[PDB]
Amino acid sequence: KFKIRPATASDCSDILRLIKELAKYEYMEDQVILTEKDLQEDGFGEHPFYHCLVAEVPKEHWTPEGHSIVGFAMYYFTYDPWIGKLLYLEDFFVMSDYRGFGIGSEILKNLSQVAMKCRCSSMHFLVAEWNEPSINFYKRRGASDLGWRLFKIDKEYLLKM
Template identity: 80%
Template sequence: MAKFVIRPATAADCSDILRLIKELAKYEYMEEQVILTEKGHSIVGFAMYYFTYDPWIGKLLYLEDFFVMSDYRGFGIGSEILKNLSQVAMKCRCSSMHFLVAEWNEPSINFYKRRGASDLSSEEGWRLFKIDKEYLIKMAAEE
C-alpha cells in the first residue's frame, strides 16, 4: 500500500490546494469558473468542508470539495480522507455528512454509495438551486 499522510491544511499548502481545485474543476468540465490564482506539489488530494445545521437533523458536516489526483487513485487515499472526515464529524457531534456529486460522475457516485451514501435527488426528490450574485444584488436593493 502506498504511504501517505492525512492532515489539516496549512497556509503553506495554498499553492497545492489551488492546483487541486483547478484539477477538480477540469475534471468536472468547469475549469473556466475557477477565478482564484496562486503561484508549486507534494499534496495529491484534498477535502474542503465546513459545518452547517439542519433544523430537522441537527449539525452536519458539508463536504464542499473532495479530490484525489488521478495518478494516485486506487491506493486508498480517498478512503482514508473520507474516514478522517467521518472521525471529524463524529468528534464534532454531526448527525450526517452532505455533499453534491455531478450526475455524470459515476465513479464518485459509486465510491460514495459503497460507503453507505444515499442519493437524495433520486430517493427524496430534492433539487439543488442557486441564486447568482447579480440577482442577490438586485434583491438586496429592492425596497
C-alpha cells in the same frame, strides 16, 4: 506511503491547483476564478469559511512538478432545522496517478472522525450524475441519495435589497 493532515496556509497553492484539476475533471475549469489569496484569507483567518484535509506524500513520490500534495477534501458545517448539525463535504479529489492507494479512503476516515467529534448526525455531498465511478465509490461506503430547485441571488441584486 502518505499522511492525511489538516491544511495549512502554505497549502493553498496546492489546494487551488487540485480544485482546478477536479473542476477540469468536471469539464468546468474555466469556472474556477478563486485565487490563492482568497483561499488564505477565507480559510486561515480568525473565522474560516471552510476546512481542508490534504494528502502529503514523501519526497521520493512528489509529482513531477515537485508537488507534495496529491489530494484533498474541503468541508464545512451546515445545519438542518429538523435534525441538527451536519458535516458538508464540498470538494474531494485525488490526483490521477495517486488514486487506488487508499488516500481517498483515509481522507474519508478522517472526515468521519471530524464528524463524530463535532457530533454531526450525517455528512452530505453532491456528485455529478455522470460521475459514476466516484458514485459507486461513495455508495460502497453508505452513501445514499436524497428534491427541490436551487436558486441564487447574486451580489448584483443582493446589493439592491
